[PDB]
């Protein structure tokens, strides 16, 4: 007999972290979520109300609704050959702001600051990020660092 209940296979996913059981620290309840915020979903096993399904554990989405104790998050899930928009109601204990927003929102500010200064100096600045390039030429000094010769070592048993 197969069993396919709602929380099947969540033995380790919904467990609390080691030495982290019990009450929720209240910064979780002091965070403010606005429509359009990007949030990570991670089910807290100790709060069983407003709990996400195991599919959304580890997914990231857009807040579309804000209620008394919960947020509505939009998730795109693959069903066959397309994506379906899923609307999940989650209590804020299972939700955290995505840290990818704060990094990109800082690059927007930095680009704006760099661009305005270049206009003040009448010069140009390039704001596109670049991949790591192959390193240039260089000269290796050997004063105090004369090359040491290594050889493969013979076989030994150490038991």
């Amino acid at each position: 007999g197969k069993s396919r209940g709602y929380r099947s296979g969540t033995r380790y996913a919904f467990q609390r972290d080691f030495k982290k059981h019990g009450a929720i620290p209240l910064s979780t309840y002091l965070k403010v979520y606005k429509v359009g915020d990007i949030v990570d979903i991670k089910a807290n096993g100790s709060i069983q109300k407003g709990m996400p399904h195991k599919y959304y554990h580890g997914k990231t989405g857009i807040v579309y609704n804000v209620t008394k104790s919960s947020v509505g998050v939009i998730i795109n899930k693959v069903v066959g050959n397309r994506y379906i928009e899923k609307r999940v109601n989650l209590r804020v204990e299972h939700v955290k702001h995505s840290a990818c927003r704060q990094e990109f929102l800082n690059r927007v500010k930095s680009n704006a600051a760099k661009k305005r200064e270049a206009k003040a100096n009448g010069e140009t600045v390039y704001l596109k990020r670049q991949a790591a390039k192959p390193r240039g030429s260089r000269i290796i000094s050997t004063e105090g660092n004369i090359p040491q010769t290594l050889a493969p070592v013979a076989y030994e048993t150490f038991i």
């Binding site: 030495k19 982290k20 059981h21 019990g22 009450a23 929720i24 620290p25 209240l26 910064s27 309840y29 002091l30 965070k31 403010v32 979520y33 606005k34 804000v66 209620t67 008394k68 104790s69 919960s70 947020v71 804020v92």
Partner: protein, 292 residues
């Protein structure tokens, strides 16, 4: 014969509670229920009336919670009462009422809701909530946080409750925990509550003790004796103070006999300092050598 319990594995797997729970000071269940705000009232804070009693002091603070820590809006302490004319019994039920009234008036002064929301100017002990004025700002809403202190009908925390409510703050409450509440006949005897507001119980103890046990009366009510304060003029001490509390509720800090730097320099002399790594290494080497 039995297994030693405090093993290294016992300590390794032990999960210490929250720092302020292990101190036995914060009830985080109640704190979560008090602090958490409706998520659609995004950054609007909930304001708590923190009321704490020490052996010598009454602390009343209006607090809003933030991620970096709680932020005090205003604060009134019982040791401020001598400025207002109450010098003894700084932990009466009536001192609690006075502290609540003071913090309410001070907060309303800070906000600007003084002329609007004056409160109960003629304290008769009736149960009443600060009702909003039509076509005007709503009264400052504050929730009572009694912490770990037990809820009993007649407790002093509800004295600060009644004082703050009469001071013009909107603090949601019921009258079934006030002194003078008849639990069998579910109505509040406002006469006994008014008695408690103006030190009536203390004055009656003074009068009842003076004619029965004068020696105990001399020790318990010393300050009243050297102040020539009898029972019949106890009430005015509170009754005037209320008026005085309403006349100038602004906070006047105590003038400090020394500066911050002087306090720090004085205190730093009586603070032992951690041994350097070399010092304890030398101690270990000496202890080894003296072992031969």
């Amino acid at each position: 014969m039995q297994k030693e319990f405090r093993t290294s594995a016992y300590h390794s797997r032990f999960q210490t509670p929250f720092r302020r729970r292990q101190e036995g000071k914060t009830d985080y269940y109640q704190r979560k229920r008090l602090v958490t705000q409706h998520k659609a009232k995004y950054n609007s804070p909930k304001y708590r009336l923190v009321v704490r009693f020490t052996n010598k002091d009454i602390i009343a603070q209006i607090v809003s919670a933030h991620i970096t820590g709680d932020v005090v809006f205003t604060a009134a302490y019982a040791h401020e009462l001598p400025r207002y004319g109450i010098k003894y019994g700084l932990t009466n039920w009536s001192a609690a009422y006075a502290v609540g009234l003071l913090v309410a008036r001070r907060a309303l002064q800070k906000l600007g809701l003084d002329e609007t929301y004056t409160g109960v100017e003629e304290v008769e002990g009736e149960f009443e909530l600060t009702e909003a004025v039509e076509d005007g700002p709503r009264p400052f809403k504050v929730f009572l946080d009694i912490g770990l202190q037990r809820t009993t009908t007649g407790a002093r925390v509800f004295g600060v409750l009644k004082g703050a409510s009469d001071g013009g703050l909107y603090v949601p409450h019921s009258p079934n925990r006030f002194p003078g509440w008849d639990i069998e006949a579910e109505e509040l005897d406002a006469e006994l509550l008014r008695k408690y507001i103006f030190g009536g119980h203390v004055a009656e103890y003074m009068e009842e003790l003076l004619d029965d046990d004068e020696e105990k009366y001399k020790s318990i009510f010393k300050n009243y004796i050297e102040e020539e304060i009898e029972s019949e003029d106890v009430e005015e001490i509170y009754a005037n103070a209320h008026e005085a509390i309403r006349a100038d509720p602004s906070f006047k800090p105590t003038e400090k006999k020394f500066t911050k730097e002087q306090y720090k320099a004085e205190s730093k002399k009586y603070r032992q300092q951690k041994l350097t790594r070399a010092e304890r290494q030398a101690k270990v080497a000496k202890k080894i050598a003296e072992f031969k």
